[PDB]
Tab-separated table of C-alpha atoms and ligand atoms in Angstrom:
chain	number	residue	atom	x	y	z
K	1	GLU	CA	-9.271	-4.376	5.624
K	2	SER	CA	-7.489	-2.120	4.020
K	3	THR	CA	-3.995	-0.453	4.495
K	4	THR	CA	-1.921	2.325	2.660
K	5	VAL	CA	1.447	1.992	2.036
K	6	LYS	CA	3.951	4.691	0.795
K	7	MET	CA	6.114	3.942	-1.210
K	8	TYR	CA	9.760	5.954	-1.370
K	9	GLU	CA	12.696	4.622	-4.048
K	10	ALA	CA	15.813	2.919	-2.271
K	11	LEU	CA	18.561	4.819	-2.286
K	12	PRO	CA	22.235	4.115	-0.823
K	13	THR	CA	21.523	6.537	1.545
K	14	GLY	CA	18.552	5.469	2.072
K	15	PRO	CA	14.587	6.595	1.609
K	16	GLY	CA	14.492	8.958	-1.353
K	17	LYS	CA	11.208	10.484	-3.256
K	18	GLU	CA	8.028	9.179	-2.874
K	19	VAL	CA	7.521	7.644	-5.762
K	20	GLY	CA	3.359	6.028	-5.198
K	21	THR	CA	1.268	4.130	-3.215
K	22	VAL	CA	-0.183	0.686	-3.155
K	23	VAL	CA	-3.974	0.193	-1.597
K	24	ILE	CA	-3.747	-3.909	-0.230
K	25	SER	CA	-6.849	-4.372	0.358
K	26	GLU	CA	-8.998	-8.026	0.831
K	27	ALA	CA	-10.927	-9.829	-2.177
K	28	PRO	CA	-12.484	-13.135	-2.779
K	29	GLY	CA	-9.643	-13.911	-4.541
K	30	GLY	CA	-7.129	-13.114	-2.540
K	31	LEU	CA	-5.347	-9.878	-1.655
K	32	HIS	CA	-5.319	-7.106	-4.060
K	33	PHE	CA	-2.774	-4.394	-4.549
K	34	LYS	CA	-3.543	-1.227	-6.267
K	35	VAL	CA	-0.211	0.237	-7.621
K	36	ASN	CA	0.460	4.027	-8.906
K	37	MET	CA	3.589	4.777	-9.063
K	38	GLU	CA	6.178	7.191	-11.348
K	39	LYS	CA	9.499	7.243	-12.266
K	40	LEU	CA	10.246	3.961	-13.305
K	41	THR	CA	12.020	2.098	-16.032
K	42	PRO	CA	9.644	1.451	-19.131
K	43	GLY	CA	9.052	-2.350	-18.492
K	44	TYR	CA	8.068	-4.668	-16.055
K	45	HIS	CA	9.278	-5.281	-12.297
K	46	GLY	CA	9.249	-7.525	-9.474
K	47	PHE	CA	6.986	-6.713	-7.200
K	48	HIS	CA	6.999	-8.531	-3.231
K	49	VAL	CA	6.212	-8.609	-0.007
K	50	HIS	CA	9.616	-8.988	2.178
K	51	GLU	CA	10.061	-9.912	5.529
K	52	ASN	CA	11.293	-6.918	7.740
K	53	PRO	CA	9.400	-3.659	8.235
K	54	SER	CA	11.980	-1.725	7.405
K	55	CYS	CA	13.204	-0.546	3.955
K	56	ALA	CA	16.614	0.428	5.730
K	57	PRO	CA	19.648	-0.530	3.597
K	58	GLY	CA	22.648	-2.601	4.681
K	59	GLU	CA	26.040	-4.182	4.049
K	60	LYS	CA	26.734	-7.699	2.714
K	61	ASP	CA	29.987	-8.825	1.456
K	62	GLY	CA	30.688	-5.108	2.190
K	63	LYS	CA	28.888	-3.456	-0.598
K	64	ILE	CA	26.109	-0.918	1.091
K	65	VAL	CA	23.089	-2.551	-0.806
K	66	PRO	CA	19.655	-0.492	-0.708
K	67	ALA	CA	16.951	-1.378	1.416
K	68	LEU	CA	19.041	-4.622	2.352
K	69	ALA	CA	16.692	-4.170	5.805
K	70	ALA	CA	13.746	-5.179	4.335
K	71	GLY	CA	15.112	-8.874	4.718
K	72	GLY	CA	14.238	-11.117	1.803
K	73	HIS	CA	11.294	-12.552	0.782
K	74	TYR	CA	7.998	-13.033	3.116
K	75	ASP	CA	8.439	-17.185	3.620
K	76	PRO	CA	6.387	-18.413	6.363
K	77	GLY	CA	6.324	-21.678	4.753
K	78	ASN	CA	9.870	-21.757	5.595
K	79	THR	CA	10.570	-22.850	1.391
K	80	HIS	CA	13.565	-20.817	0.852
K	81	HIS	CA	12.678	-20.432	-2.959
K	82	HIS	CA	10.851	-17.662	-5.310
K	83	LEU	CA	7.750	-19.525	-7.439
K	84	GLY	CA	5.627	-16.206	-8.114
K	85	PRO	CA	2.076	-15.655	-7.561
K	86	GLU	CA	0.961	-19.189	-8.443
K	87	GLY	CA	3.473	-21.042	-7.206
K	88	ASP	CA	4.001	-22.927	-3.627
K	89	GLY	CA	7.230	-21.171	-2.752
K	90	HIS	CA	7.603	-17.458	-1.388
K	91	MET	CA	4.465	-16.511	0.109
K	92	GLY	CA	5.523	-12.662	0.021
K	93	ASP	CA	5.723	-13.232	-4.463
K	94	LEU	CA	3.499	-10.849	-5.872
K	95	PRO	CA	2.590	-10.463	-9.125
K	96	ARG	CA	5.070	-8.321	-11.493
K	97	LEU	CA	3.848	-4.476	-12.453
K	98	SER	CA	4.065	-3.186	-16.108
K	99	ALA	CA	5.221	0.225	-16.287
K	100	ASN	CA	3.932	2.207	-19.144
K	101	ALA	CA	6.898	5.102	-21.365
K	102	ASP	CA	5.764	7.752	-19.150
K	103	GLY	CA	7.617	5.178	-16.274
K	104	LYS	CA	4.357	5.169	-14.760
K	105	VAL	CA	2.428	1.767	-13.025
K	106	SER	CA	-1.173	1.951	-12.089
K	107	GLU	CA	-2.909	-1.477	-12.219
K	108	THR	CA	-4.019	-4.025	-9.645
K	109	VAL	CA	-2.321	-7.001	-9.372
K	110	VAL	CA	-3.610	-9.786	-6.849
K	111	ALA	CA	-1.847	-12.723	-4.751
K	112	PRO	CA	-4.452	-15.869	-4.601
K	113	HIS	CA	-2.641	-17.279	-2.090
K	114	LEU	CA	-2.974	-14.502	-0.010
K	115	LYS	CA	-6.066	-14.127	2.511
K	116	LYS	CA	-6.219	-11.446	5.210
K	117	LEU	CA	-4.067	-8.108	5.205
K	118	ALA	CA	-3.284	-9.031	9.099
K	119	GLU	CA	-0.960	-11.753	7.258
K	120	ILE	CA	1.790	-9.003	6.121
K	121	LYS	CA	1.484	-6.433	7.960
K	122	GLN	CA	4.781	-5.264	10.131
K	123	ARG	CA	6.395	-6.173	6.565
K	124	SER	CA	7.618	-4.258	3.915
K	125	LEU	CA	6.604	-3.786	-0.289
K	126	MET	CA	9.364	-4.242	-2.371
K	127	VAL	CA	9.433	-3.062	-6.222
K	128	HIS	CA	12.448	-4.100	-7.994
K	129	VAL	CA	14.647	-2.789	-10.986
K	130	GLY	CA	14.353	-6.335	-12.731
K	131	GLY	CA	11.243	-8.198	-13.768
K	132	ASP	CA	10.699	-11.431	-11.804
K	133	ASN	CA	10.014	-14.699	-14.093
K	134	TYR	CA	8.403	-16.383	-11.262
K	135	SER	CA	12.147	-18.752	-11.075
K	136	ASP	CA	15.415	-18.705	-9.349
K	137	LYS	CA	16.580	-19.384	-12.661
K	138	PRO	CA	18.227	-18.306	-15.105
K	139	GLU	CA	18.823	-15.678	-11.875
K	140	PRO	CA	18.355	-15.724	-7.982
K	141	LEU	CA	14.858	-14.317	-7.069
K	142	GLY	CA	13.289	-14.084	-10.277
K	143	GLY	CA	15.756	-11.706	-12.090
K	144	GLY	CA	14.468	-8.641	-9.455
K	145	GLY	CA	18.341	-7.211	-8.818
K	146	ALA	CA	18.512	-4.408	-7.255
K	147	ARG	CA	15.123	-2.774	-4.851
K	148	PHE	CA	13.944	0.100	-6.486
K	149	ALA	CA	11.495	1.094	-4.224
K	150	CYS	CA	9.889	0.319	-1.037
K	151	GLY	CA	7.187	0.958	1.273
K	152	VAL	CA	7.170	-0.848	5.421
K	153	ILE	CA	3.546	-2.055	5.789
K	154	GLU	CA	2.467	-0.989	9.277
M	201	CU1	CU1	11.718	-8.398	-3.646
M	202	ZN	ZN1	10.421	-15.168	-3.555
């Protein structure tokens, strides 16, 4: 199977402009994520499956957090730590995306630990402002920081 997810900029006011799409498809080496996105800052961006089928903001510690309602990283093993697509932490950890000088992402990444699309239906896809060092050191959650764009996987 396959599905296409529309990605919207995550604002304090919720979903903003459409910034691109992700096609998720099944493949021998693990799920493929074909990403076409624009208006990113050049450089690496963290990319993860989050646990809830919502991209709404929320409040944490009295602060409005764009796309907070997507929850944390998809983590069916309840591992509670971030180890990237080759580690055995959050199963939602995908390979980082690479935006070029024009702010565009156009690539496929592969999650060898995810086999079936059904595993991540009714979840969400998140692209972050920061990158992803596949660790919780020196910063939590790979240093992804704020949520840049989000889409629901139906
Ligand atoms: Cu994330
Ligand atoms: Zn993670």
